[PDB]
Design a protein around this ligand. Structure first.
Ligand SMILES: CC/C(=C(\c1ccc(O)cc1)c1ccc(OCCN(C)C)cc1)c1ccccc1
Ligand SMILES: CC/C(=C(\c1ccc(O)cc1)c1ccc(OCCN(C)C)cc1)c1ccccc1
Ligand SMILES: CC/C(=C(\c1ccc(O)cc1)c1ccc(OCCN(C)C)cc1)c1ccccc1
Ligand SMILES: CC/C(=C(\c1ccc(O)cc1)c1ccc(OCCN(C)C)cc1)c1ccccc1
Ligand SMILES: CC/C(=C(\c1ccc(O)cc1)c1ccc(OCCN(C)C)cc1)c1ccccc1
Ligand SMILES: CC/C(=C(\c1ccc(O)cc1)c1ccc(OCCN(C)C)cc1)c1ccccc1
Ligand SMILES: [Ca+2]
Ligand SMILES: [Ca+2]
Ligand SMILES: [Ca+2]
Ligand SMILES: [Ca+2]
Lengths: 214, 13, 214, 215, 209, 13, 13, 13, 215, 209, 13, 13
């Protein structure tokens, strides 16, 4: 498979080039939020992002090598983690707030508009602050988001495992090129992947919240 | 329903 | 803090020495399982393991440096992930089955005794098979379990972060000492930590199942 | 009044900075277009662009000085012309095609999917071709689009203010052309060629509104 | 080619010499009167167009296309020009002057009436000159159907000549360079409103057929 | 009829 | 509906 | 109830 | 019958391999003992050990050859003696203390927490001290514990089978002592010293059962 | 010290010479008769104990402790020994022989009765000898309270002597080394049953006080 | 209860 | 009484 022949630079370049567009929100800016209208806005946005997620996923090296069944499974399990890592990324420059869209910036007190949502907001804000504190790079972000897709859900190594190994190589390459020592490289790799556990957690709580309100 | 298995299948094939 | 002065060998030695006892189950072996009795057995076992988890946690380097409040929080969030990683570890030599205790080995078809539990069993079995395929070492296992405790839930680095960096160093040391190349070391570190995301997922589904049956 | 105090370079900057986001479309890409689905897609896009048009209009020098009534009137009159000039601009470097969105590029044959739409497509395509052949610049484009906003409803003292704003945009177009090195004769000839475009844009908007009403 | 060689003064002269006569309203409904007039003006428009420099260089096909596109605009700009000295009224003919409230005679026409009146008011406020008016009418003829390419290149050169001619007229009147550019823009923006009114008129006409 | 395509064609040739 | 007088008025104030 | 916050607090203090 | 065919070394191996797991206790370690809580803790432990005792008994050579009735009888008679000898063994290297579990080590003063229990503690401690001073070996211990199982109820042809099994365990004890280098005189003296221990274990079990009945 | 120097034959002789007489039941309830007998046998037990080699070397305190612990065991082993030739019966005295069904006279005693009968049956099946019996009775005296340390060391040496003496008796009777060890074990395991029966008896006695 | 005749019997068969 | 600690003490000295 071509995906496994990519150099680290070629992997980064492919992942940057696969990025979906940044979506704007539409709303009446002279009308105040309600529970219904805020959840309505976030739902509309997520559903638009899902369409563009499909085009993105097909551009992630290795993804189109999978059967339709495997492609569907990875996306069905990973989509909310993928929305959330994106949100946390674009919120880094806005402490205490979540930048859902360039024209939709919500602070923690606005999260209380939707019953139960503020617990999720606080987890997302902490994650965003952690990425800021770590000085997460865009090249690192795109590697993590593809890891989420491929690690989604639950002979030696299948295709996905081999592609994930290449993304690890690429993360380490990025760190090495930035001048990190080998010890620093392994430490930062660990710190980043541990945050994926927290993103999984936040997705599980989110899916819970979505299923219980449906 | 966006995000459902069936929706993903429809969109990918 | 003393924990941060530990060499990699001293960390491994401390974590091995902290290990709790392997618990046996008690049941009438001439009576067949029921839903009530199997869930009853697993509940009894988990509750016993929780007592010994407290003694274990206090022996994890760094844990007793934390305030009572932080200690309680880490344990409250991590306990089921900790039970599950232990289960998956002791099941490695038993493909298709889960070794809850040395005298309680349950196969997948027995998981169907308890409504909803078989989905969890299948995730646990896959994780155990993954660890087997990776040839997970006991020294690596104890590092991962302590990572779970410390990474539980959701100025540059707090104490927990610094201790987690030392456990990463220790994992890499173990891999280096086994003769892995630097590329192999970083790849295996990533593979292991990605499995922690799946353990988080399984814990979230488990807590769901426990809350819904209560 | 800020608008009349702007130098030509400040006017260009303000108009460039005011630009709305480029919108993407959403659709099932494994499913063929029908008349209903294509018209639904273009309707969806236009309705979304209308929301962002409001934020742009408020950043056009002079617009926010007007009363609410006047703002509503100018936007109500000009909005389809504003959508169409934007469409023509983004299609300029795609001969034969209309770039509704970066992921929605349609040719004239696809226009036949909706009864009566191909005639409108052809007009839009000829206008985009004219733009290309004039080598229309983005700075000129933003001037023209703001002229549409201020002019289309301007007959149907605050009206004297709009006319002084319109005169400033004219000064701005000539400035851009003089800076580009055009002779005095080329500057007035190109000013005329650009403003005559706006009569064709009005025509296409009228034909579009007529088509929208009939369905 | 003969058109492309004319001086600005010769272009003005040719456009003025091409002007059709002013027609009187005649009796065979208000729409009946207007239709009578329009159909008679169309005959004069044919020979006017043929006297607009550059027009007869075009193929028959192109001449038909341009006139088919522009004719109602040409009638309307004429109407607006002759209503200039009649605030609040439209002078369809010397013997047919209507105020706004008379426009309500035909369901639909009074929208059009007010637009024509606002345009005539603009002409008055700008103090539009006859020489400028004839330039604008010839621009309508050559521009309105023009986007739809040598024949169309030639048209663009003639259009550039008429622009040169407008600027010549403004310079001669003593406007500064800035005033000339501003006024050229003001006058060309009127043609957008004339297009609008023609499109609305054509809509009305087609729907009653 | 006056103003038609055919009428313009006939009048212009 | 979007683009109507009332919609513009609502959105603008 | 083993595993609850209050249980953990009791056991640790 | 497998049991009577075992060599002495095979008997030792089988008895060593039969050993039950060492059990841990659970309790709140920030909470002081009371009479109720300590007695509850020891009751809990004993009840759990009883479950594992069944699996051990079935691995004792000869036991499973007996009828259900005989198995029940021997276990019903011997179980507290079996718990107590195990307790004494695991306490051997902890002078003054009883090692109920690796995480439950109690001294005689803690025995006073339960009315009447200190007298039993003292007897168990003296027996553990005797074990230590004899340097009792684990191979000897497993022989003695199995003798308790087979002997305690053995009066209250299948009974001739148990007696031949008991004789084999005696042969096994002497073998272990001869292998250790004891003289013939030291072998019979130590065999007697070890078997006399079992009279004290019976005494402590009887006192324990009496205490359990009274409360 | 005198005890520690005796040969095996001298130990046997001393133990035999120390034997108390067999008492007859006498009349002052079945428990009344047994109590009468027991209390009379206790007096003889005092002088018997003092004639067991090693016993009087111990302090008064230790002598009291040992007898206080062992006395009912000593009575019971005596009872079992003299019932040996009476299958299904207990010969409390020559003039007091009870069968199992007579044991039901005292609520509680018939549990004890059956145990004593099963032990007497075991003695018969082993063909226990008088010389062996006297060794076992002296072991009970010295062992039963012994775990509770020179005085207690001395006791252990005397206990080892009695073991040597049992083995001497078995060797003399022509048992092989293996038979000697097996029989020594069989006889010592009986003392566990004798302890059990004494503990049960003492329970009964204390509860009726 | 654990250790009784019936408990042993139940556990042994 | 016979068999008591005090009785044994008295009989043995
Ligand atoms: C945490 C923000 C959020 C959503 C969100 C996150 C990131 C982002 O870029 C956009 C939205 C969210 C909200 C709703 C939602 O609904 C999906 C309904 N479709 C799938 C039918 C998905 C995500 C949300 C999720 C669960 C409950 C409440 C709020
Ligand atoms: C997956 C096995 C399991 C439990 C388990 C896992 C590992 C282990 O070593 C022992 C048990 C499990 C079952 C019950 C349980 O209850 C806790 C109740 N207490 C906390 C009040 C905890 C874990 C379980 C968890 C949730 C639902 C159903 C089953
Ligand atoms: C020519 C493309 C087009 C529209 C369009 C133009 C530019 C652009 O950027 C996006 C769309 C179009 C389609 C529908 C529409 O109105 C929807 C009704 N809303 C306003 C209530 C407006 C423009 C259209 C207009 C009329 C008929 C058929 C198609
Ligand atoms: C605005 C006045 C007008 C006409 C008009 C304009 C200027 C002028 O000088 C003379 C008349 C108008 C009315 C009717 C008309 O019909 C043409 C029918 N022929 C073409 C068969 C044309 C113009 C008119 C046009 C459309 C609807 C209603 C009224
Ligand atoms: C001496 C320790 C002890 C028990 C014990 C001994 C050894 C061992 O390994 C564990 C415990 C003891 C306590 C209770 C008990 O029975 C509980 C009742 N069940 C059997 C129904 C048995 C032994 C005990 C016995 C009687 C009274 C007081 C305490
Ligand atoms: C087994 C016969 C027996 C006694 C007995 C045994 C052997 C023997 O040679 C003579 C009697 C027995 C009965 C009573 C008794 O009381 C002593 C009261 N004195 C000590 C104040 C002692 C033994 C007995 C003991 C306890 C309960 C019931 C019966
Ligand atoms: Ca499809
Ligand atoms: Ca509003
Ligand atoms: Ca506490
Ligand atoms: Ca059973």
């Amino acid at each position: 498979s071509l995906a496994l022949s990519l150099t680290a630079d070629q992997m980064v370049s492919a992942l940057l080039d696969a990025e979906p567009p940044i979506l704007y929100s539409e709303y009446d800016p002279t009308r105040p939020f309600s529970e219904a209208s805020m959840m309505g806005l976030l739902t509309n946005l997520a559903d638009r992002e899902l369409v563009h997620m499909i085009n993105w996923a097909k551009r992630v090296p290795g993804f189109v090598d999978l059967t339709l069944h495997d492609q569907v499974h990875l996306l069905e399990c990973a989509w909310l983690e993928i929305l959330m890592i994106g949100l946390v990324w674009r919120s880094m420059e806005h402490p205490g707030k979540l930048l859902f869209a360039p024209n939709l910036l919500l602070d923690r007190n606005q999260g209380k508009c939707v019953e139960g949502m503020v617990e999720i907001f606080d987890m997302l804000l902490a994650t965003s602050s952690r990425f800021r504190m770590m000085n997460l790079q865009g090249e690192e972000f795109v590697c993590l988001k593809s890891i989420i897709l491929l690690n989604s859900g639950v002979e030696e190594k299948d295709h996905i495992h081999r592609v994930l190994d290449k993304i690890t190589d690429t993360l380490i390459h990025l760190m090495a090129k930035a001048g990190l020592t080998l010890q620093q490289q392994h430490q930062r790799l660990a710190q980043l992947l541990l945050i994926l556990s927290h993103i999984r957690h936040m997705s599980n709580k989110g899916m819970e919240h979505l299923y219980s309100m449906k | 329903s966006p995000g459902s298995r069936e929706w993903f299948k429809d969109m990918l094939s």
